[PDB]
Symmetry: C2
């Protein structure tokens, strides 16, 4: 029933499209190193690369964690296409995770033989953090998620966190906190044991995957004039003059609604664009301040568009930039446009303001008979009553959710990188190898530092349920679809290479179907 020669799970990887629901099942194989050699280590940094915003104080743990938070973990490229071409929206309903077929392997080294055997009596520890009492590291856009491609085996990331540091240095504060993860009740698993967990997502709005089919400022009827008048000019006396707003003149018409917030970020020309030679580009990025340090915010807040339709100019600090292939840890290499997957928000340009331009102008003075009217442009503007914008699009390579920070107050909790802001997101699932001491022949009151070196492996299946929003549209002519289109392909995209390396050439977002404002 439960033992060494009986499998504790099966491989469920599949998708089931039923009505407005869809359930996606994905199973992967993982391997867990024994991190720190069963130690909690205090990690810290001072200012590096000329910035004291890189200073931190924190801890690294023996534990490791499961990260479900990228879309390609749950979705096939063909299932993502079926979703984005056919639907106006989706949101996650529920989640359940299972960890099974555990294998603990003891490794030994004598004169460089390095033999490996399996320890049938050894245990692994697993707990889920249901009450959100640990620092939540998942939604921050870091590596270690289940692979995009099911055959791939992956290592679990090491768990660690940064607490408060003092005066932008590597030293701690009195409010720097240490969290022991052994002080949670956890479940201990041998080979025949398995683990199961179930979670229900809180109510969130649908991700709206459509593009606006109208301009925000062109919403008026082009055939009929307005009954509203505008101040046109003033005669040779100071007397003021008025004209009627006519038909399709959209510069002059009255508006109910206004674009979303903005801040200006530098545009850079990809491809044939000429740009400028030998820029260092760190000093001129947009920044914010905390605690006397200056941080780059590489996504900006929502309400802008990084690219304007078919132009070469991108903001690059308003963009999500991906690599076409995974990289080694700590790679300082320089990459070009061809190596990069550079997303475009230009499907939102009707309702959103371009990031590399000014946002408008306002009056800078009071006129008189003596002085003429004057204006000036503004490079930043924030939330205004009657504003409408679109949120950052979601990509198959991008994050599903984020956790809203726990403080007093927040506004419109939509993550800048993308996805769903969640007060109670899917909990963190943490796992470690239980230590097995080496040969100890004596009593000592100092803790045991000599352990059998070992690692564990197994399978994990995740099952998510998604709610779908049907596309109900009276558009007569055909729409834009995500299609598989390449001229003289030397390989097929989203498939293994001749070596076995899985290749993804281009990013895929959700906004294709079009809808009127």
């Amino acid at each position: 029933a439960d033992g060494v020669g009986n499998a504790s799970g099966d491989w469920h990887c599949d998708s089931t499209w039923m009505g407005d629901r869809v359930v996606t099942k994905s199973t992967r194989t993982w391997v867990l190193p024994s991190y720190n050699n069963h130690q909690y280590r205090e990690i810290k940094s001072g200012s590096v690369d000329g910035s004291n915003a890189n200073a931190y104080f924190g801890y690294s743990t023996p534990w490791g964690y499961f990260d479900f938070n990228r879309f390609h973990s749950h979705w096939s490229p063909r299932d993502w296409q079926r979703l984005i071409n056919n639907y106006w929206g989706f949101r996650p309903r529920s989640l359940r995770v299972k960890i099974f077929n555990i294998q603990v392997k003891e490794v030994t080294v004598q004169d460089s033989t390095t033999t490996i055997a399996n320890n049938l009596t050894s245990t692994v520890q697993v707990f889920t953090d249901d009450d959100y009492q640990l620092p939540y590291v998942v939604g921050n856009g870091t590596e270690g998620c289940l692979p995009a491609f099911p055959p791939q085996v992956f290592t679990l990331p090491q768990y660690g966190y940064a607490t408060l540091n003092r005066d932008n240095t590597e030293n701690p504060t009195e409010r720097s906190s240490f969290f022991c993860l052994e002080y949670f009740p956890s479940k201990m698993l041998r080979t025949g044991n398995n683990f199961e967990f179930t979670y229900n997502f809180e109510e969130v709005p649908f991700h709206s995957s459509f593009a606006p089919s109208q301009n925000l400022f062109k919403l008026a009827n082009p055939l009929v004039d307005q009954y509203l008048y505008r101040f046109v000019s003033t005669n040779n006396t100071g007397g003021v003059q008025f004209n009627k707003n006519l038909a399709g003149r959209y510069a002059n018409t009255y508006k109910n609604w206004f674009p979303g917030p903005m801040g200006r970020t530098q545009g850079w020309n990809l491809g044939s664009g000429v740009n400028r030679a030998s820029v260092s580009a760190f000093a001129t990025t947009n920044r914010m301040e905390l605690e006397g340090a200056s941080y780059q915010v590489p996504p900006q807040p929502n309400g802008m568009t990084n690219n304007l339709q078919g132009s070469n100019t991108y903001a690059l600090e308003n963009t999500m930039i991906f690599n076409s292939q995974p990289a080694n840890p700590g790679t300082t290499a320089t990459y070009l446009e061809g190596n990069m997957l550079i997303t475009s928000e230009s499907e939102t340009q009707p309702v959103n303001r371009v990031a590399y331009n000014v946002g408008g102008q306002m009056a800078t003075n009071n006129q008189s008979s003596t002085t003429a009217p004057a204006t000036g442009t503004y490079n930043l503007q924030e939330i205004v009553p009657g504003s409408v914008w679109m949120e950052r699009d979601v990509y198959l390579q991008g994050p599903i959710w984020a956790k809203i920070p726990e403080t007093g107050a927040h506004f419109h909790p939509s993550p800048a990188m993308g996805g769903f802001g969640l007060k109670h997101p899917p909990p963190m699932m943490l796992i470690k190898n239980t230590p097995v001491p080496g040969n100890i022949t004596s009593f000592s009151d100092v803790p045991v530092s000599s352990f059998i070196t070992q690692y564990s492996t197994g399978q994990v299946t995740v099952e998510m349920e998604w709610e779908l929003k049907k596309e109900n549209s009276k558009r007569w002519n055909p729409e834009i679809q995500y299609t598989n289109n390449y001229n003289d392909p030397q390989f097929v995209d989203f498939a293994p290479d001749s070596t076995g390396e899985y290749r993804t050439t281009r990013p895929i977002g959700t906004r294709y179907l079009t809808r009127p404002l």
Copy 2:
């Protein structure tokens, strides 16, 4: 309830996607001329344009008919896209037609005033031919269908047919038959009256809209060898030698299945292809014989592909060729490639043989010590046991169904032009204006030849139900979709022009999703 000031129907134009069903409703406005001036006229022709296959004998009638038989009558360009991108097949389940809001208009001419008034007492006659007793003219690819675009008003075609003629001349036979359409019971309708009809399609196979994802002859595993051997050669003595069939050598492997039938038609190079100058091209087309005359068959039989993938060469006598815009009756103008919508069957090239090449070769002799083996190519081959092919694709601009001719025998009744072969297709719905005599002050035994000139108009709604075949596929990577893609468009396609003229630039077929053999 039923009268002049009460509408007898409503405008239903819509589509409802429910599960595997979809119902498409479309309403149009029609106008019916009074044809022949209420006369049956015997029409005939001798050999014209140098061909006695153009000779015929037949009759034209005062009647006119409703023709539902093109796909764009029932389908929007956006609904056709949703169909062909998401589904593996469809077939019609049921049909119902309604004719309502009848208006009869009397026209009079005095000294070129040409006034028009409405005759409230005048009638229109409508019958459906349920028993298939009339010549069925609908499925033959001729004009007069409900428009593609709902705002358009259309004239009903005049009903007529050709019977037997004698010795390829304009004269009749003893088996030439005359059908009076007054000798059917029909329903007479004034302004407040309406007509309704319901029909259930007989069981037919799904139109298979997918492309094959494998080659017919490449179905073997490329990794493993066959256990079968081939005759390779013979040594210096006549002794015969054999080799094993190896792995991925698909020229040499044994086959279970064979391509469909063929006949060779001349290929012609579109676009930059050089072709040949000043060809008359009628004498060299493929033909068949009946009754001592020679007819061009401009579609060929099924089982070939007109285009080979991205080549410029087309068969043009294996192709369905459409005009991007409707034309006037009897237009002798010459058209170029740009005016034409030229379909490609190349998605069937894995399973179907190209029409402009030979189909293979066979042994032409018996060898000996004296004579060497010889072969020769064949330009035509027909149905063979174990043949597999794909049927002609259906297009939004093309016919839905055809009627299988009533004879003793037939084989595989799939129409060459496309769609569904039907023993009992949707009946013909015939309509005429009832005659109103002019002023007759005397008795004569010769029939009344003087009538009030008048026409009628109204609305017709058609409602069809379609059964759908879900696409169930394990393909990992994305597929090809029909997308709305144009570089620097000066107009939007499948929408009215600045003048109001509805524009369709390109043909749309059903085969996009891919499936393995």
